[PDB]
């Protein structure tokens, strides 16, 4: 009795809070999974107010030009601005546990690192964001289709509530197993206009979405719908943010060894002439 | 030439004063091409002298087996004024990199993977045959329809001869219908692949696609330490082997041209997907602001 009997059933979106191989199997089969309470409630609020002065100093473009900055606020300096983010959020042992299952190969250590730490605030009345796969950032990845390896995963967590009215992200579970990965355009996508989405949540909930999954933010009067994006890429890919050049050394000295690897203060990709870059940085005892 | 003697594959050769389009077509048909005089003999010789102290402090690893007896040094910008002020400012290098990597309206499509002096010691065993894009392990699966991951300007610092271990290359292997690793399990041509040495004088280089099968040769000499300079260049979305922006000092970065700063990640480049996004950037701006490079 999930939908009234005889109905069209809409694409499945499982939900967990919880065993790791369990949530991974839901990730594999559907491409998207809600993780209710990825961050503790006081933590999400401790973080949200912590960055609210940064967010307050971001002007809103009323552009009507169709891009992803049209009435949507975006801010990446979450490690400087928020001690909660860098000391608590970035240290979820289940996040690494899932990252290690999507990305790492055994005996090769950590196969992943951060792409971005973005806070995305859909300002009230914003056009819907164009449908896209996150792996379009790495433009050849679609050409490998669903047999290709994973490019990117986003732990996309709600900061303020995600409702079907304020602009919550619309997911297309199963778009990671389609046979051809295209740009989602009428010219390029044979299924344009017929793509069935599901809107994605309360503060503290994440959703782990594969980079192969089609999605977008949707279109109220006062609701600043705010989210925290933990985009994570394999170690061979380059990050959107030059974190080891903007995050001060002081904060990097406070990070765990694994979090230093996430931001590229530690490494052989991204090495230093056969040595770990962390030697030259004064980070190895 | 040879006498009904079997004719082995050609490696096209051009001088550094040929037109980039002439050299790129050769690169395009064969996946590799020799640029003679890529670096002047006086530039090569100053570079070799400027890094030689660092090469002398590198021990020769001899093992009981695995690509030993090869010295590898990547701190070229730090050690060599000639390298940073001149070698990396080759306009021919950048002309060709744009033709491979740069997309319309997006600026530089490429940056440095590595800057490696590679000195094959006397008696060093030959290197396994490989493609350089194997470093990005998924790339072979796109086959020859795929885009370029990586290219290398592989420069003779000292002469390349067949005896001292000049690289063995396989022209046209960037066009085989299936890109596998070169082993008995996966490669059906295994043990049947015909290679060709890159015979070069100092300052010559060959430019080679990451799709081309190749390996360092056996250094069968008793005396010759065969020195090379590998300028490996990747597209902007790929991670470098070297964290250049974290070991190269800022004093050296402020002296770099803007295209050099981009190569080493002291500066960002703009990517378009209807949307524009700085790659390797800082919260919407070039990282060169926060670093103080204008
Ligand atoms: C330009 C953009 C790109 C190319 C990248 C993208 C990206 C890093 C990619 C997906 C990912 O892994 O992480 C997150 C969630 C952090 C996003 C954040 C937003 C941006 C920076 C972007 C943008 O802000 O446009 C000015 C977009 O909104 C979008 C979707 O069009 C893009 O694909
Ligand atoms: O803002 C959102 O809800 C979706 C985030 C997203 O799709 C992106 O910008 O990559
Ligand atoms: O040194 C050589 O001749 C070949 C080296 C090489 O091909 C490599 O390191 O990928
Ligand atoms: Fe997205
Ligand atoms: Fe090689």
UniProtKB/Swiss-Prot annotation, chain A:
Record-linked InterPro entries: Phytyl_CoA_dOase-like
EC number(s) reported in the record: 1.14.11.-
Residues noted as binding Fe cation in the record, renumbered to the chain: 132, 134, 215
Keywords per UniProt: Dioxygenase, Iron, Metal-binding, Oxidoreductase
Catalytic activity: preaustinoid A1 + 2-oxoglutarate + O2 = berkeleyone B + succinate + CO2 + H2O; berkeleyone B + 2-oxoglutarate + O2 = berkeleydione + succinate + CO2 + H2O; preaustinoid A + 2 2-oxoglutarate + 2 O2 = berkeleytrione + 2 succinate + 2 CO2 + H2O
Cross-referenced Pfam families: PhyH
Protein name: Multifunctional dioxygenase prhA
GO annotation terms (biological process): paraherquonin biosynthetic process
Gene this chain is encoded by: prhA
Organism: Penicillium brasilianum
